[PDB]
Protein backbone atom coordinates (compact mmCIF):
# COMPACT_ATOMS: atom_id res chain seq x y z
CA UNK A 1 0.00 0.00 0.00
CA UNK A 2 2.48 2.62 1.25
CA UNK A 3 -0.04 5.32 2.18
CA UNK A 4 -3.67 4.80 1.12
CA UNK A 5 -4.33 6.04 -2.43
CA UNK A 6 -1.03 7.90 -2.51
CA UNK A 7 0.06 7.15 -6.07
CA UNK A 8 -1.04 4.99 -8.99
CA UNK A 9 0.12 6.46 -12.31
CA UNK A 10 2.81 8.82 -13.59
CA UNK A 11 1.33 11.82 -15.37
CA UNK A 12 0.94 11.85 -19.15
CA UNK A 13 2.54 14.79 -20.99
CA UNK A 14 2.47 16.96 -17.89
CA UNK A 15 -0.64 16.67 -15.76
CA UNK A 16 -4.18 15.26 -16.03
CA UNK A 17 -3.66 15.40 -12.26
CA UNK A 18 -0.81 17.76 -11.71
CA UNK A 19 -1.49 21.09 -13.29
CA UNK A 20 -5.04 20.28 -12.20
CA UNK A 21 -3.54 20.33 -8.72
CA UNK A 22 -2.31 23.78 -9.43
CA UNK A 23 -5.64 25.11 -10.57
CA UNK A 24 -6.69 24.03 -7.13
CA UNK A 25 -3.43 24.96 -5.43
CA UNK A 26 -3.82 28.43 -6.82
CA UNK A 27 -7.45 28.94 -5.86
CA UNK A 28 -6.22 27.79 -2.49
CA UNK A 29 -3.43 30.40 -2.14
CA UNK A 30 -5.53 32.94 -3.91
CA UNK A 31 -8.03 31.95 -1.21
CA UNK A 32 -5.62 32.67 1.68
CA UNK A 33 -5.10 35.71 -0.54
CA UNK A 34 -8.87 36.21 -0.41
CA UNK A 35 -10.17 39.34 1.27
CA UNK A 36 -11.61 36.65 3.50
CA UNK A 37 -8.10 35.59 4.69
CA UNK A 38 -6.55 38.97 4.02
CA UNK A 39 -7.19 39.73 7.62
CA UNK A 40 -4.33 37.39 8.37
CA UNK A 41 -2.79 36.03 5.19
CA UNK A 42 -1.95 39.45 3.96
CA UNK A 43 1.53 39.28 5.79
CA UNK A 44 1.99 36.09 3.88
CA UNK A 45 1.04 37.41 0.37
CA UNK A 46 4.12 39.36 0.76
CA UNK A 47 7.37 38.65 2.57
CA UNK A 48 7.97 38.96 6.30
CA UNK A 49 8.56 42.67 6.61
CA UNK A 50 11.75 42.74 8.56
CA UNK A 51 11.48 46.50 8.76
CA UNK A 52 7.82 46.85 9.52
CA UNK A 53 7.90 44.02 11.99
CA UNK A 54 11.14 45.35 13.48
CA UNK A 55 12.65 41.92 13.18
CA UNK A 56 16.44 42.37 12.82
CA UNK A 57 17.07 38.77 13.96
CA UNK A 58 14.99 37.71 10.94
CA UNK A 59 17.90 36.74 8.68
CA UNK A 60 19.23 34.62 11.53
CA UNK A 61 15.99 32.89 11.96
CA UNK A 62 14.77 32.82 8.49
CA UNK A 63 16.58 30.89 5.82
CA UNK A 64 13.66 30.51 3.47
CA UNK A 65 10.82 32.82 4.09
CA UNK A 66 8.02 32.00 1.75
CA UNK A 67 5.37 34.42 0.65
CA UNK A 68 1.90 33.61 -0.66
CA UNK A 69 2.68 35.84 -3.64
CA UNK A 70 5.77 33.96 -4.90
CA UNK A 71 4.23 30.57 -4.41
CA UNK A 72 1.29 32.00 -6.22
CA UNK A 73 3.45 33.71 -8.80
CA UNK A 74 5.06 30.34 -9.36
CA UNK A 75 1.56 28.90 -9.73
CA UNK A 76 1.04 31.74 -12.15
CA UNK A 77 4.38 30.67 -13.55
CA UNK A 78 3.44 27.00 -13.67
CA UNK A 79 6.76 26.73 -11.97
CA UNK A 80 4.88 24.61 -9.53
CA UNK A 81 4.46 21.22 -10.99
CA UNK A 82 1.53 20.59 -8.81
CA UNK A 83 -0.19 21.74 -5.75
CA UNK A 84 2.46 20.02 -3.69
CA UNK A 85 5.06 22.31 -5.22
CA UNK A 86 2.46 24.79 -4.17
CA UNK A 87 1.87 23.78 -0.60
CA UNK A 88 5.50 23.02 -0.19
CA UNK A 89 5.93 26.76 -0.26
CA UNK A 90 2.77 27.39 1.77
CA UNK A 91 4.35 25.09 4.36
CA UNK A 92 7.55 27.09 3.75
CA UNK A 93 5.93 30.45 4.72
CA UNK A 94 4.10 28.76 7.50
CA UNK A 95 7.32 27.05 8.61
CA UNK A 96 9.53 30.16 8.58
CA UNK A 97 6.72 31.83 10.43
CA UNK A 98 6.42 29.59 13.54
CA UNK A 99 10.15 29.06 13.05
CA UNK A 100 10.70 32.72 13.88
CA UNK A 101 7.54 33.23 15.85
CA UNK A 102 6.28 31.87 19.17
CA UNK A 103 2.69 30.50 19.05
CA UNK A 104 1.52 33.42 21.17
CA UNK A 105 2.43 35.68 18.28
CA UNK A 106 0.37 37.62 15.82
CA UNK A 107 2.23 36.23 12.76
CA UNK A 108 1.58 32.76 14.01
CA UNK A 109 -1.98 33.79 14.81
CA UNK A 110 -2.26 34.64 11.15
CA UNK A 111 -0.09 31.69 10.21
CA UNK A 112 -2.37 29.15 11.90
CA UNK A 113 -5.45 30.59 10.24
CA UNK A 114 -3.84 29.95 6.90
CA UNK A 115 -2.63 26.67 8.32
CA UNK A 116 -6.30 25.82 8.86
CA UNK A 117 -7.61 27.07 5.51
CA UNK A 118 -4.64 26.03 3.33
CA UNK A 119 -4.55 22.54 4.86
CA UNK A 120 -8.33 22.20 4.53
CA UNK A 121 -8.00 23.43 0.97
CA UNK A 122 -5.08 21.13 0.43
CA UNK A 123 -7.05 18.18 1.77
CA UNK A 124 -9.19 18.70 -1.33
CA UNK A 125 -6.12 18.19 -3.53
CA UNK A 126 -5.81 15.10 -5.77
CA UNK A 127 -2.73 12.90 -6.25
CA UNK A 128 -3.91 10.45 -8.82
Amino acid sequence: KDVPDSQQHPAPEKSSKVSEQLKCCSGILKEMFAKKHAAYAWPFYKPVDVEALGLHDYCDIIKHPMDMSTIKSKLEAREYRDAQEFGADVRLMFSNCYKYNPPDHEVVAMARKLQDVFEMRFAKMPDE
Binding site: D49, I61, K99, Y100, N101
Partner: peptide
Protein backbone atom coordinates in the same frame (compact mmCIF):
# COMPACT_ATOMS: atom_id res chain seq x y z
CA UNK B 1 17.29 33.08 22.08
CA UNK B 2 16.22 30.84 19.15
CA UNK B 3 14.17 33.50 17.39
CA UNK B 4 13.17 37.11 18.14
CA UNK B 5 9.50 36.17 17.84
CA UNK B 6 8.99 38.73 15.03
CA UNK B 7 7.10 41.41 17.03
CA UNK B 8 5.67 41.82 13.59
CA UNK B 9 2.12 42.42 12.30
CA UNK B 10 -1.00 43.61 14.04
CA UNK B 11 -3.46 42.48 11.36
CA UNK B 12 -4.23 46.13 10.56
Amino acid sequence: SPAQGKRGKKSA
